[PDB]
Amino acid sequence: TSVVIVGKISFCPKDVLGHGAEGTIVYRGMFDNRDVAVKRILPECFSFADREVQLLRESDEHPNVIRYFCTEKDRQFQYIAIELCAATLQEYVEQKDFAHLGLEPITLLQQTTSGLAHLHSLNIVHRDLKPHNILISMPNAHGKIKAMISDFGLCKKLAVGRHSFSRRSGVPGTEGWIAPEMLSEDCKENPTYTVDIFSAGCVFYYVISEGSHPFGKSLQRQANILLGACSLDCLHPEKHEDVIARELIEKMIAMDPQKRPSAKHVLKHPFFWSLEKQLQFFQDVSDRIEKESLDGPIVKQLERGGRAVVKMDWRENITVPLQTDLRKFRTYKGGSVRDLLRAMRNKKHHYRELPAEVRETLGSLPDDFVCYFTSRFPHLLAHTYRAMELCSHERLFQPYYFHEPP
Amino acid sequence: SVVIVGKISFCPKDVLGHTIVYRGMFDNRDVAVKRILPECFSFADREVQLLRESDEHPNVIRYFCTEKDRQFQYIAIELCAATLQEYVEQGLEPITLLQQTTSGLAHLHSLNIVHRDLKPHNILISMPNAHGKIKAMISDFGLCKKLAVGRHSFSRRSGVPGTEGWIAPEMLSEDCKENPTYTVDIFSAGCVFYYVISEGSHPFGKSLQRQANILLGACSLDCLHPEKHEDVIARELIEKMIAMDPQKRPSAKHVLKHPFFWSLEKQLQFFQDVSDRIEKESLDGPIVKQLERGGRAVVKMDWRENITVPLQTDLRKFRTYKGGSVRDLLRAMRNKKHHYRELPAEVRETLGSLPDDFVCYFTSRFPHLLAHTYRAMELCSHERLFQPYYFH
Ligand SMILES: O=S(=O)(CC(F)(F)F)Nc1ccc(Oc2ncccc2-c2ccnc(N[C@H]3CCCNC3)n2)c2ccccc12
Ligand SMILES: O=S(=O)(CC(F)(F)F)Nc1ccc(Oc2ncccc2-c2ccnc(N[C@H]3CCCNC3)n2)c2ccccc12
């Protein structure tokens, strides 16, 4: 046995969870009969620790920002206790420990981004988002696990009426996760909240690819960031889920910080839509364009590059029972995105009246039904989502697109 | 003078309530500090032990710190703006407050925790957060019971709770055959719902006679107008929540699914989904028979006589709409929603914009339509399409 007791914190010095700069050690421990991680801080880091703890409180909490419990202080050290977690996201991905924990990659990214949006809403820029500082919780009483943002060491609270900070104020971040504007030769624009969106974009790809980075292996990574030399080749170019992820990630890691979406904007992206929501979008689009002119801006935009999206004739690329069922309505043009969406809407709307064989090939509503189409037309959602930005201001489409408040 | 006990400090002059509750400080956070006497030490330990497991949820109060000196024990929780009693007696929407309270209750019940003492004094209203938002939180874990896994009932106890007025009849009367379950909290919550929406009335009357009226089943929900949509929906929920038969009271998750909580958009979507679902149904089949049972009263004999003239004019294009039919009223609503952009300006103007004003056009004129339709369409509650609207 070995236990150190400092006020309300106890820990086992043999149970080391990690090590930092300036002699910092993290141990497994207990506080108020709760499992905790206990960080021991040296005198030189007392002012540093007080600042970050102040910030991790003084700030409203959120489920996806790590819970801070207790500080204690003896003659030699300070101790900070936070909730004990199962893993870092780095450990989770590097070990491919999916069977053990069971947390879905999209949900963990949604949770991380919700935590990020919360920090940004408090005028807090994190500046050090990376898989090592995204923590994965222990299962709750219902077996549920969540991602939480940690490590507030580089965080900046921007003053009221300040929307940027100096790139020389402290350490720039962690090599390989630093936005190009932090280290570029020319300081064209001061860094903003979008430094975290860049880092988050790299994290998204890291999680979805199961361990690759958009800017390559560690040795060349930060140099590649400065060059803008990325590859997202783990994302299949003709797979719906990957096409959608690529469309988002490309914007998140854009070299121009002003082209990166805000955290709340990222949360609205189709990457995060349920299957039901994806189908509802297609239905809403089809209803919106049903009486639209073929030569108007909406249909022209929807049909621009449309032949690739429908694979020249979409009737070739659907199962035979559906082909048979669609011969009744000879007004569907195989070359048309509008008409594919019309066919989808028609079969969704009349689903109960369709023959058993047609219901069977489509699968049930909404999940299997929408996958029938997205599995066969991998660009259809991404293309349509882009094209229908023309209607993004309309009340019907406000659920699908992001509009910033001021 | 400020008392310091470990991490907790307070000025003894700064009393929030009475055991004494002070305003104090813990880790540079404003807190409420309860001082516990020796007689209550085990009681305090039990409730704190239980609360560490549920605080966590945003609608269950956050527990911060305990201390113990030679004479007393101290418990610190977040400082709140008000109790729900204070809030009602003296900018959160009332429905949202009740949704939040119910979400906190559902969380407790999901952990097999029965509260047993829910009342407006025990629902705390937070201080505004950094974006000005306030929320309700369940507090006072003194009588909470954690049921063993797979166990649903517990014993009545003489003096649980000590203060009358909000207690389900099966908690008190030995005449009740069945022991109390989690549904005691739904009863209490039912009374709270009515208290909030009525702005201070109680279904079982003034404070003195409340508990005796509870035992008799003598309630009145007369603040809820019988021909106003919002009140018809609230009454239908509340009357189930305060039912004398505990097994007829809906679970907390069931309450959360009730139309009481639906946005106007969601009310409209339900109508649309219903109309789509019954479009190819036979008139003699059980779905449409159920929907048309009592239907003439719901449509006020002829719904075409109870809509505005521009809409009447617009609907005579489809001469096959039956004025006595609920199904056809719902068909008209769905048709006009679907074709809204193509309607003449005068018709768009009378209906109002989609979805909010549009659905209110109909629910204001046919106050029983949603309540009726929701009841009738229970026949489809198992179907995937109706998963938004019912709990199973
Ligand atoms: O977020 S902070 O800014 C909070 C403030 F503001 F209050 F200081 N700083 C901290 C950041 C991170 C920490 O924790 C850790 N550091 C390094 C490595 C691991 C961990 C950690 C944390 C939780 N669980 C587990 N579990 C292990 C189990 C076995 C498998 N690997 C995961 N590990 C901190 C710990 C204590 C105090 C502060 C920490
Ligand atoms: O929920 S419990 O079971 C937690 C456990 F399990 F940890 F004990 N017990 C407790 C229940 C309730 C308490 O709080 C209060 N009691 C009585 C009166 C007031 C308050 C209170 C609480 C917070 N804010 C404000 N503000 C005033 C401002 C002026 C206008 N009225 C609202 N008041 C508790 C306080 C400390 C400790 C325990 C409390």
Side-chain angles (χ1 to χ4, degrees), chain B residues 53-67:
Chain B
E53 309 171 13
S54 48
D55 84 349
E56 59 204 289
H57 187 271
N59 315 116
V60 177
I61 194 63
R62 219 219 274 199
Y63 151 70
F64 279 119
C65 176
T66 56
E67 304 285 7

Side-chain angles (χ1 to χ4, degrees), chain A residues 14 51 67 79 147 168 170 177 208 270 343 348 387 392 398:
Chain A
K14 196 168 179 60
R51 289 172 182 180
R67 207 167 147 188
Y79 301 85
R168 279 83 191 74
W177 308 88
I208 298 293
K348 176 177 185 300
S392 70
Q398 288 173 31

Side-chain angles (χ1 to χ4, degrees), chain A residues 17-19 26 36-39 49 52-54 56 66 68-69 80-88 91 132-133 135 149-153:
Chain A
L17 306 182
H19 304 90
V26 180
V36 290
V38 180
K39 183 174 278 192
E52 70 184 344
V53 168
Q54 188 170 39
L56 186 55
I66 195 68
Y68 156 69
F69 281 120
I80 299 162
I82 64 166
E83 70 184 279
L84 187 66
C85 293
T88 71
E91 289 168 331
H132 179 271
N133 53 32
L135 296 177
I149 293 177
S150 77
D151 201 334
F152 280 65

Side-chain angles (χ1 to χ4, degrees), chain A residues 107-220:
Chain A
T107 304
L108 90 75
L109 298 170
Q110 197 276 340
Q111 287 163 348
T112 304
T113 308
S114 183
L116 191 58
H118 179 75
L119 295 173
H120 294 178
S121 79
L122 304 174
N123 313 126
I124 297 169
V125 189
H126 187 280
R127 310 194 324 104
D128 203 20
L129 196 64
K130 56 180 172 178
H132 179 271
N133 53 32
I134 295 163
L135 296 177
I136 305 310
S137 71
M138 296 295 299
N140 72 5
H142 295 91
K144 308 302 184 193
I145 302 285
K146 60 175 178 167
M148 295 174 292
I149 293 177
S150 77
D151 201 334
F152 280 65
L154 302 188
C155 80
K156 290 189 182 289
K157 181 137 188 146
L158 305 193
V160 177
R162 294 301 312 283
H163 307 85
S164 64
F165 58 95
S166 165
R167 72 184 190 159
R168 279 83 191 74
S169 302
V171 165
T174 300
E175 184 177 356
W177 308 88
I178 296 160
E181 70 275 18
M182 296 298 297
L183 297 168
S184 56
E185 290 173 44
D186 203 7
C187 191
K188 186 177 171 170
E189 59 215 300
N190 287 336
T192 72
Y193 305 98
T194 56
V195 300
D196 292 338
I197 303 297
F198 179 87
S199 304
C202 296
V203 170
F204 277 41
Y205 186 75
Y206 178 82
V207 170
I208 298 293
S209 75
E210 299 181 18
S212 294
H213 193 278
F215 300 91
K217 269 74 164 153
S218 301
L219 182 58
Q220 298 306 143

Side-chain angles (χ1 to χ4, degrees), chain A residues 147-337:
Chain A
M148 295 174 292
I149 293 177
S150 77
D151 201 334
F152 280 65
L154 302 188
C155 80
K156 290 189 182 289
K157 181 137 188 146
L158 305 193
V160 177
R162 294 301 312 283
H163 307 85
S164 64
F165 58 95
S166 165
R167 72 184 190 159
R168 279 83 191 74
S169 302
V171 165
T174 300
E175 184 177 356
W177 308 88
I178 296 160
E181 70 275 18
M182 296 298 297
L183 297 168
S184 56
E185 290 173 44
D186 203 7
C187 191
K188 186 177 171 170
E189 59 215 300
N190 287 336
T192 72
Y193 305 98
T194 56
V195 300
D196 292 338
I197 303 297
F198 179 87
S199 304
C202 296
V203 170
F204 277 41
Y205 186 75
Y206 178 82
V207 170
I208 298 293
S209 75
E210 299 181 18
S212 294
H213 193 278
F215 300 91
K217 269 74 164 153
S218 301
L219 182 58
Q220 298 306 143
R221 196 170 279 170
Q222 198 62 54
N224 287 341
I225 292 168
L226 274 65
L227 293 168
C230 59
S231 175
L232 304 177
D233 60 1
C234 293
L235 301 170
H236 191 297
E238 312 298 334
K239 188 177 299 308
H240 167 72
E241 298 74 14
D242 292 14
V243 168
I244 291 287
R246 181 190 291 264
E247 205 285 316
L248 176 53
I249 291 165
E250 281 173 348
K251 295 208 169 186
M252 294 177 77
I253 70 169
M255 295 295 101
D256 183 351
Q258 297 192 55
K259 294 182 185 145
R260 297 178 203 145
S262 76
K264 288 178 174 164
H265 196 162
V266 169
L267 289 170
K268 285 278 174 171
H269 196 272
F271 182 69
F272 297 116
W273 297 357
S274 69
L275 299 177
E276 185 183 332
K277 181 169 180 181
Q278 291 173 46
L279 187 54
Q280 196 65 47
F281 182 69
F282 289 138
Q283 182 180 283
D284 289 347
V285 172
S286 183
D287 296 340
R288 178 63 183 82
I289 75 186
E290 182 55 30
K291 301 221 169 293
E292 193 69 26
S293 190
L294 293 176
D295 304 324
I298 293 164
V299 176
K300 279 182 166 179
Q301 192 89 286
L302 198 61
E303 303 297 357
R304 182 174 167 74
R307 295 191 305 178
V309 171
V310 300
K311 303 155 133 186
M312 292 283 164
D313 183 345
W314 57 260
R315 297 162 302 171
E316 295 171 340
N317 296 283
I318 49 168
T319 63
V320 169
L322 193 57
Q323 291 180 353
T324 302
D325 203 53
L326 291 165
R327 286 185 163 74
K328 292 176 185 180
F329 289 107
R330 214 185 291 268
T331 53
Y332 299 142
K333 302 187 177 182
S336 167
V337 176

